[PDB]
C-alpha cells in the first residue's frame, strides 16, 4: 500500500529550514486545513520547496466554548510557523464545515481575529457558495476525497511530502514526535472501526488544495 | 563542476538517524580514509544505495608527529560508533605516498586506540611492495581521476549526504563542519586535504574494493 522505504525516508530526512538564507526556492504561501469534529481536531500547515511539499505544522486536539479553543489552537500554530519562516507572506486557510457550516464560520472569523492581532499578513479563506447562493469561508468536503487520498499516497511513495526539523506542534510535541505520531496514522490509510484519522486527513487536504485549480477559491475574509 | 542545488540541498538535508530503529537498510560498516601531510580524515557509511558522512576532521600540526595524527582519527571514530550501535565493522584506508613505512605505524596506532576503547572488527586496506609484503596502507595513483569523477557524478545526483549530528572535534564551534567542507567542494577542477578524504572514503565503499581490506 504505502512503502516501508517511503516511510523510513520521511522519518530520517527532514528539511533544515533554518540552515540557509537562500529562500529563492521555497513557497511564500502557507496553506492550512482543519478537520474539527469523543473525536479530535486535525490541523496541518504546509508550504512548497522546489517541486515538493514541506510540513511546517501539525496539531491534533482533544477536549470554554469548543469553538474558541479550536480557533485558538490553530491560530497559535500559524503565528509560530510564520515566526520561524519570515519568507512566508500569505495564508491560504481552509475550514471543513461539513457537519456544521454554522460553527466553522465563526471559527474562520476567530482565527483571523487572533492571527492579525499577532502579526501583519495577507489572510485568505477557502470560500464556497452557501444555501442562499452566497460565499462563506468554509470547505464542504466530499467527492474530491478519493482523488486527494489516491494523490497523497502516490506523492508520498515517490517522496514529495517531507517534514521540517523545526515543525511546530503545541498539542503533539510534548508527548510524541509529531512525525512518528503522524506515521501511526498514515500506516492506517485505506483507499475507499476505532482509528482517529484527523491529523492525516488534515495533511492530505492541506496538500491537495495548493494547486492552481483551487487558486481562486481562496478570497479575502 | 557542481550544481548550485546539490550544494544548497546538502546544506539543508541531513540524516536524522535516531528516530529510526530499523537499521535494516543501514550500512553496518563504517569506512574511514585519511590523507597525511594539512591532514584530513573522513568517516563515511551507506544508506541503501546512497552515502552518508558520519565524521570529519582537518588537523594541523611539539613532536610525536604520527601519534597526534592517529589519536585524532581514533577519537572521532569511537565517538561515531558510540552514537550508531548498528555499526559493527570498520574499513580504514590510510594514504601513504611520501613515506609508506610511517603510513603503516599510523595504521597500527589507530588499531590500538579503538580496540582499547571498544570491541569491534577492524580491517585496513592492503598493498604489496618490493618484497611481496601485503602491507596495511593504500597508495594513490591513476585512480584519483576516476574516483573524483564518480564523486562529482554522485554528489550532483544527491547521493552524498550528512548526518544531522556528525562528529567533528577538529573543527566544530567557530565553523560549521558542513559549511566548512562545502567551501572546499567549490574549488575542485579535474588547500584540499579534507574533500579528497571524502572523495576517497565514498569511493572505497564499492564492492570491487572489498578484498583489498584485511584484518591487520
Ligand atoms: Mg547554510
Ligand atoms: Mg521512528
Ligand atoms: Mn471531518
Ligand atoms: Mn475527522
Ligand atoms: Mn596526500
Ligand atoms: Mn593532501
UniProtKB/Swiss-Prot annotation, chain B:
Domain of life of the native organism: Viruses
A GO BP entry: chromosome organization
Compartments where found: Host nucleus
Keyword Hydrolase applies: yes
Coarse class of the protein's main subcellular location: host cell
GO cellular component: host cell nucleus
GO molecular function: DNA binding; hydrolase activity
Entry annotation: catalytic residues: 35 (for nuclease activity), 95 (for nuclease activity), 193 (for nuclease activity)
Region (Required for interaction with UL56 and DNA packaging): 141-161
Keywords tagged on the record: DNA-binding, Host nucleus, Hydrolase, Viral genome packaging, Viral release from host cell
Similarity remark: Belongs to the herpesviridae TRM3 protein family.
Subunit relationships: Interacts with the terminase subunits TRM1 and TRM2. Interacts with portal protein.
Role played: Component of the molecular motor that translocates viral genomic DNA in empty capsid during DNA packaging. Forms a tripartite terminase complex together with TRM1 and TRM2 in the host cytoplasm. Once the complex reaches the host nucleus, it interacts with the capsid portal vertex. This portal forms a ring in which genomic DNA is translocated into the capsid. TRM3 carries an RNase H-like nuclease activity that plays an important role for the cleavage of concatemeric viral DNA into unit length genomes.
Protein name: Tripartite terminase subunit 3
Amino acid at each position: 500500500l504505502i512503502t516501508d522505504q517511503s516511510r523510513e525516508e520521511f522519518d530520517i530526512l527532514r528539511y533544515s529550514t533554518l540552515n540557509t538564507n537562500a529562500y529563492d526556492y521555497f513557497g511564500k504561501t502557507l496553506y492550512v486545513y482543519l478537520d474539527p469534529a469523543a473525536s479530535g481536531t486535525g490541523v496541518a500547515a504546509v508550504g512548497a520547496y522546489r517541486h515538493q511539499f514541506l510540513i511546517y505544522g501539525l496539531e491534533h486536539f482533544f477536549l470554554e466554548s469548543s469553538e474558541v479553543a479550536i480557533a485558538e489552537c490553530a491560530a497559535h500554530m500559524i503565528i509560530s510557523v510564520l515566526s520561524l519562516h519570515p519568507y512566508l507572506d500569505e495564508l491560504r486557510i481552509a475550514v471543513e464545515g461539513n457537519t456544521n457550516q454554522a460553527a466553522a464560520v465563526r471559527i474562520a472569523c476567530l482565527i483571523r481575529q487572533s492571527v492579525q492581532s499577532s502579526t501583519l499578513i495577507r489572510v485568505l479563506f477557502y470560500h464556497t457558495p452557501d444555501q442562499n447562493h452566497i460565499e462563506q469561508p468554509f470547505y464542504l468536503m466530499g467527492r474530491d476525497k478519493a482523488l486527494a487520498v489516491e494523490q497523497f499516497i502516490s506523492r508520498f511513495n515517490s517522496g514529495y511530502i517531507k517534514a521540517s526539523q523545526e515543525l511546530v506542534s503545541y498539542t503533539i510535541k510534548l508527548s510524541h514526535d509529531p512525525i512518528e505520531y503522524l506515521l501511526e496514522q498514515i500506516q492506517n490509510l485505506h483507499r475507499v472501526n476505532r482509528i482517529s484519522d484527523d491529523l492525516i486527513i488534515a495533511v492530505i487536504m492541506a496538500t491537495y488544495l495548493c494547486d492552481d485549480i483551487h487558486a481562486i477559491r481562496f478570497r479575502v475574509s
